[PDB]
């Protein structure tokens, strides 16, 4: 038997639950009712990058806000120039099944992983011209669902074996494994200081991890279905998720509870990608009915629709200067919005 | 200064799209198949100079609602059906009814021979005379493999209209080549609206 401590885990769950009910003195909608709203956000697609052959599962911007990488299931890792619509590189991948990609903040590397259970680091800035694999990071069971660089040497990767992992690229081994999710971890997002990161999974739960301690700090259970997307607020003191129950939710690291739900009656399709604007007033959520509803992150009402895609929007990224939104989809086109 | 970074950027761009054109002629020429019962096992084979690709998932969990969405672009989902047969109906019922796997055809292969326990309706079932075997293995075996064929065809002929097709077989590489030909042909008749 195990009920000597099973009911201990529910009686701990009760006293955490009303500790949040003792902390919910108001709601975010009561505080921000007198905030005069954004208005009507009307973004036109400036660009449309046409070079992929299959569905794009992930893109990632560069910190110079001009280059972006995008991975597709044809076996490609095309680095684009968004200003000029020029492909800078086009990396062929060993595995066609690639579900994530990342760009280094320095700009020297890209990572990509997928159903080969392996994160592959590619040195862009080599002295040969031909972009070759810097490292394969093979310690994960199950598919690789996200990867985000910390610097040129450290990358955190979430995977399908319900664990995240902090790697060391020059050694190849993983420094820290982050366990606790019961469903497979679908997305992560680093804090702006990169001392923390959140991670959503298919257990309808989002956990907050310390990167250097390696432990879970807080757990956020407010959704109903598999969380596909997660993104920090620009302050780093809150984050926003998106799951298969057609709701985004703004969680909160300090109050340890959700503040706001971003719902509509006309929306019954899951969120695949969320991001914020540069200030965090807008929450751009990519959907399965092929458009990207822009949410007023304080008023909870929709401020615009980014309807230009023909298949399911799989990724979404706002620049580090807040000047563009690059949404890829399952038709092989990334569109830069503005 | 003003062209030294730009007209040489559009030169390395046009050396990319020459390789993206050879990579497009080989992407449309290969047929990707998902075979299910590192983390992927790519298996190349070629039947009559048409190259096929078959991907058996290896080190993956038995939770599959999230990586099965990668395989909606494939030509045909090979579903090998070896209690454990009711679990294969409920898996095929999920592949057939998935929102992304609604345009993906299912080749379906069958193996086992020797039930009325896990299927009590089988005892009230005789084989269709309209579909017969030639070599005559047993009258009592061909009434059983035609039952579990009609268990998997009760799923396919239930509200799954002309966008994906089930091809059930009894057990082989020639049969996948003849079914992938039918999948591509029926797609080209749906584009001209002849099917």
């Amino acid at each position, epitope marked *: 038997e195990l009920d000597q401590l099973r009911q201990e885990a529910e009686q701990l769950k009760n006293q955490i639950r009303d500790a949040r009910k003792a902390c919910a003195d108001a709601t975010l909608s009561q505080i921000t009712n007198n905030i005069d709203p954004v208005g009507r956000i009307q973004m036109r697609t400036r660009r449309t990058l046409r070079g992929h052959l299959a569905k794009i599962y992930a893109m990632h911007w560069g910190t110079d806000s001009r280059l972006l990488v995008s991975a597709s299931q044809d076996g490609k890792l095309i680095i684009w120039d968004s200003y000029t619509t020029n492909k800078v590189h086009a990396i062929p991948l060993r595995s066609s099944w690639v579900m994530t990609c990342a760009y280094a903040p320095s700009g020297n590397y890209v990572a990509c992983g997928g159903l080969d259970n392996i994160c592959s680091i590619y040195n862009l800035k080599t002295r040969e011209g031909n972009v070759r694999v810097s490292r394969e990071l093979a310690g994960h069971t199950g598919y690789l669902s996200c990867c985000r660089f910390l610097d040129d040497n450290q990358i955190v990767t979430s995977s399908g074996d319900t664990t995240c992992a902090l790697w060391d690229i020059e050694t190849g081994q993983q420094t820290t494994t982050f366990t606790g999710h019961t469903g497979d971890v679908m997305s992560l997002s680093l804090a702006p200081d990169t001392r923390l990161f959140v991670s959503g999974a298919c257990d309808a739960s989002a956990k907050l991890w310390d990167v250097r301690e390696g432990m879970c700090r807080q757990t956020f259970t407010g959704h109903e279905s598999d969380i596909n997307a997660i993104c920090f607020f620009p302050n780093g003191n809150a984050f926003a998720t998106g799951s298969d129950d057609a709701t985004c939710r703004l969680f909160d690291l300090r109050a340890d509870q959700e503040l706001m739900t971003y719902s509509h009656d006309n929306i019954i399709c899951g969120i695949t990608s969320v991001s914020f604007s540069k200030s965090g007033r807008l929450l751009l959520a990519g959907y399965d009915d092929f458009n990207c509803n822009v949410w007023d992150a304080l008023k909870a009402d929709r401020a615009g629709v980014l309807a230009g895609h023909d298949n399911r929007v799989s990724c979404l990224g706002v620049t580090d200067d807040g000047m563009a939104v690059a949404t890829g989809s399952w038709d092989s086109f990334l569109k830069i919005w503005n | 200064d003003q062209r030294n970074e730009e007209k040489a950027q559009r030169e390395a761009n046009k050396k990319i799209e020459k390789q993206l054109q050879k990579d497009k002629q080989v992407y449309r020429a290969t047929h990707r198949l998902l075979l299910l019962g590192s983390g992927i096992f790519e298996t190349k084979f070629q039947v009559d100079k048409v190259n096929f690709h078959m991907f058996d998932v290896g080190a993956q*969990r038995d939770e599959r609602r999230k990586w099965i969405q990668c395989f909606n672009d494939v030509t045909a989902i090979i579903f090998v059906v070896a209690n454990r047969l009711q679990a294969a109906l409920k898996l095929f019922d999920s592949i057939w009814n*998935n929102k992304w796997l609604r345009d993906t055809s299912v080749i379906l292969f069958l193996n086992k021979q020797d039930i009325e326990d896990y299927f009590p309706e089988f005892a009230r079932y005789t084989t269709p005379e309209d579909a017969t075997p030639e070599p005559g293995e047993d009258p009592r075996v061909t009434r059983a493999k035609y039952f579990i064929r009609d268990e998997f065809l009760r799923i396919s002929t239930a509200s799954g209209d002309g966008r994906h097709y089930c091809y059930p077989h009894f057990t082989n590489i020639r049969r996948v080549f003849n079914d992938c030909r039918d999948i591509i042909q029926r797609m080209h008749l749906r584009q001209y609206e002849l099917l």
Partner: nanobody
Framework: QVQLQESGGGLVQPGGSLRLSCAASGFTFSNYKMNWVRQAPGKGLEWVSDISQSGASISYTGSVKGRFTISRDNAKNTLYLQMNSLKPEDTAVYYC?????????????????????RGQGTQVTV
């Protein structure tokens, strides 16, 4: 938080009856297809029954058909399973598993690994 507390169970004579409830928490019960899933001692998890989001489309496995019935009450957020004419082969731990997404017809929820949206189970013995 998705919590599913299934009730009922216990010991029964071969030929007896049971009524397993399942109180659902943390999600709108009306949007999800709900299942009943059992795990026999020494076996893996096999799927038992199923019911659509309104109570219209109802399925059973072959070994329980006729004897078992499934029911849901979207107003009281409770999923039922009446197990009449029980057998010695029917003893298992009965889980109340739901499908992972709302408004869908596909479910992937008999997994040896941890499926998240099922209950801890109730034990049915004979």
């Amino acid at each position: 938080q998705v919590q599913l507390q299934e009730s009922g169970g216990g010991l029964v004579q071969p030929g007896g009856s049971l009524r397993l409830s399942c109180a659902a928490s943390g999600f709108t019960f009306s949007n999800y297809k709900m299942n009943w899933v059992r795990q026999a001692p020494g076996k893996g998890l096999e799927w038992v029954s199923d019911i659509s989001q309104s109570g219209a489309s109802i399925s059973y496995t072959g070994s329980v058909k006729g004897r078992f019935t499934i029911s849901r009450d979207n107003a009281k957020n409770t999923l039922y399973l009446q197990m009449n004419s029980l057998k010695p082969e029917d003893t298992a731990v009965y889980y109340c598993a739901r499908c992972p997404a709302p408004f869908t017809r596909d479910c992937f929820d008999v997994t040896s690994t941890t499926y998240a949206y099922r209950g801890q189970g109730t034990q049915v013995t004979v």
